[PDB]
TrEMBL record:
Organism: Cereibacter sphaeroides (strain ATCC 17023 / DSM 158 / JCM 6121 / CCUG 31486 / LMG 2827 / NBRC 12203 / NCIMB 8253 / ATH 2.4.1.)
Domain annotation Activator of Hsp90 ATPase homologue 1/2-like C-terminal: ranges: 20-148
Signal sequence, renumbered to the chain: none
Name this protein carries in UniProt: Activator of Hsp90 ATPase homologue 1/2-like C-terminal domain-containing protein
Pfam families per UniProt: AHSA1 (PF08327)
Membership in a protein family: Belongs to the AHA1 family.
InterPro entries linked to this entry: ASHA1/2-like_C, START-like_dom_sf
Biological classification of the source: Bacteria, Pseudomonadati, Pseudomonadota, Alphaproteobacteria, Rhodobacterales
């Protein structure tokens, strides 16, 4: 299951195993047609998804909850080495602009996803540690597990 890493005063780390070849996991983590099918929280399906996994690429995501209100984020792909590494910035609407790092290394069983998020300040890293973000992000991986298996 999902392991919290040590990180630092402005950095959060996560690691998770996935039963699939990194080539499949990368397609899941970067495709606009597959991301909506797993990366969402309870009652907030992904309604808009623009993802371009190449330097300078645009990232635009929007979730719509019950009642109609939205929540979204924009970011830019800084670099992309399929399938082992991807770096992009993220900015919702908060904390401040964040830099997210995804590293995919083959492990026995399938693939291990190492993720890191560098925050603006150490207090921005604060407000976020107090968010069911870790929780929601495991609920999402669980979704991803079911999708990989159904494939």
């Amino acid at each position: 299951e999902i392991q919290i890493g040590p990180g630092s005063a402005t950095r959060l780390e996560f690691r998770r195993h996935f039963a699939a070849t990194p080539e499949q996991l990368w397609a899941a983590l970067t495709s606009p047609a597959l991301l909506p099918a797993w990366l969402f929280a309870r009652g907030w399906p992904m309604t808009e998804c623009v993802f371009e996994p190449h330097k300078g690429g645009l990232i635009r995501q929007v979730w719509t909850g019950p009642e109609g209100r939205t929540r979204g984020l924009t970011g830019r792909v800084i670099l992309a080495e399929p399938p082992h590494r991807l770096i992009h910035s993220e900015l919702y609407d908060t904390g401040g602009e964040t830099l997210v790092t995804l590293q995919l290394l083959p492990v026995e069983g399938g693939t291990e996803l190492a993720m890191a998020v560098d925050y603006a300040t150490p207090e921005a890293r604060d407000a976020v540690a107090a968010s069911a973000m870790a929780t929601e992000m495991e609920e999402a991986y669980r979704h991803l597990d079911v999708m990989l298996a159904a494939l």
